[model samples]
Target chain A: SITKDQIIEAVAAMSVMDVVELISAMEEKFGVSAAAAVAVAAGPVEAAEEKTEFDVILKAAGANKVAVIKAVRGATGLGLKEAKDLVESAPAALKEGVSKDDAEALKKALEEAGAEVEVK
Target chain B: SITKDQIIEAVAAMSVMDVVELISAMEEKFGVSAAAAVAVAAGPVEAAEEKTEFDVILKAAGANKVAVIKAVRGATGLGLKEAKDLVESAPAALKEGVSKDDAEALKKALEEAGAEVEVK
Candidate 1:
């Protein structure tokens, strides 16, 4: 019989990445949900309190409109036409309810593409 | 006057990391925010649609309560006492309003530490 100790021992031997993958496998095999308890018990801390929703606004599409379109598509997962329209509109909201880190990452991408962005 | 082409050319010569830093530098120097337009214009694509809030529950603390506490601290940035209390509660909600990807990442960390987690 597989004892709890045996399972614990085996899990202890696994790397964090392996364990992460194992969780997925276990869920798939057992056809049951995982993560609820483990997340609270052993998950990584978020480092900061949650922030309310914010708007990511596109001030200027900049010189590289194509790059802007691509970035818009990346941030919002919008299609080409949608991204284009958003860019063309100018002074529009790109996304909302984004985390600060995500907003910052998106900002970096847009600036690199030569556009002006504002997080509001 | 500094032409847009000159600016674009200079940016083109910089590495992605350099450009990212430059964006931050520009923001700081100009006392203006950046990221809104650029995120939509040049940011990396988010592969999936945004997920709504989720509750990360601690189903079981498993064999090691200490490890669980550490993981809880890491995920929520909670103090030792707070983390301990949350873990002791068992089947408690750890965090909410987390993205699916973030939830998955947290789940991996918890399971690796020998706890059972569920994302709901």
Candidate 2:
């Protein structure tokens, strides 16, 4: 019922040595093999942290790919460090009250920056 | 406003030693004071476990007070232990496929058991 190709395909991405070490760690801590731990850990991180209105606006700019952190820092008159933190922490800065006209301007800005823009 | 009657009434149901031990357990486990743990532990259990059809019918007879563990277990051809386990495990069992008349019959049984019954 099983084939070498299936076995190889299953273990191909991980080296044998790494698998041995992984199994050892799993056994020591949880009494389960590395395969089970890896199986549980393989689930996707799809849920976003629900944000408040202020957080939503502040985090959208970088997420929507309209403005670079530097531009936001400069435009908002925040320090380089503060701007970078804002960009990383909340990418939605420019996303609040996003209107058709503002979206057009964003597209134009991205084009001038040598970045490809898509309406969708 | 804070009387010994109120304080004693709050803690009187359980032995004083239990109150002390509960506080110690709460502190060791959750880092909460005994007073705070007592408050939280006092909250009611309201959520019902989801059950399937067969489980529902067997469970409902027990929960609705129509039959004791003995009668339902006997009817279901289960031993004393098995009946107790089944009735306890699935007290809401007969809830599935239950009609208005079956419910009325169940209420009448409860009344015969000298137990108060409420339709709602």
Candidate 3:
């Protein structure tokens, strides 16, 4: 039988990354994700409020592929080839975890280029 | 030349979508991204803090494809075929705009099933 004190000591010795892994493992075995509950209990209200990132989705590339590609390049700062590849991959994420304003701006550029876009 | 008030009136007449596009075009021409500054000025401090959604990325599907596929199905509530397709598309998004807790749990399940996962 494992002692509670021993388990505590072992946990304390683990690195932060390892501790996170352990928590995930425990959550899986128990069939419960304690993140929400723990967050509510801990109530880091300030942290919870932060707007971390946003996603810009290329919903569709309309008739003007060239225009859309140029817009994508401008917004993402990706090279021409990369931007073209991204444009070709329609209904894909153009940018992930960007600022809200960036997402909106990217969507606007794509839309102006005759492509449909969505900011999530 | 278009007067500022006339431009404002024209903007007021445009559809929400068109207005968004106009902002993007204006930003591009002016070489500025007003979103950050606008957000600061409007100062929706409370709104800025809300945690709206999260992304779960399938970093890698490890040795056990079957286990990973099963785990994906469990987390996403997708049909077996859809789940398998998702697992096969490694480095793809598993779920987007989900709650933080859901993202964490999905990541945990995939990790336990021997897949490398990331929550954003």
What range of 10 consecutive residues in model 1 chain B has the weakest lDDT sum? B1-10
Error of 3 at A85 (Å): 1.8
lDDT of each: 0.74, 0.47, 0.71
TM-scores vs. true structure, each candidate: 0.32, 0.19, 0.30
**Residue A102 CA error for candidate 1 (Å)?**
0.8
Tell me which of candidates 1 and 2 scores higher on lDDT.
1
Instruction: Kindly list the interface RMSD, in angstroms, of each predicted candidate in the order they appear.
Output: 25.8, 26.7, 29.6
Alpha-carbon deviation at B32 in model 2, angstroms = 73
Clashing pairs in 3: A49-B49
| Residue B96 C-alpha lDDT in model 1 | 86
Residue range B3-57, candidate 3, lDDT tens digits: 3233344545657687566555535654555554434355445553758599888
Question: Which is the winner by TM-score between candidate 1 and candidate 2?
Answer: 1
Any idea what lDDT model 3 has? 0.71
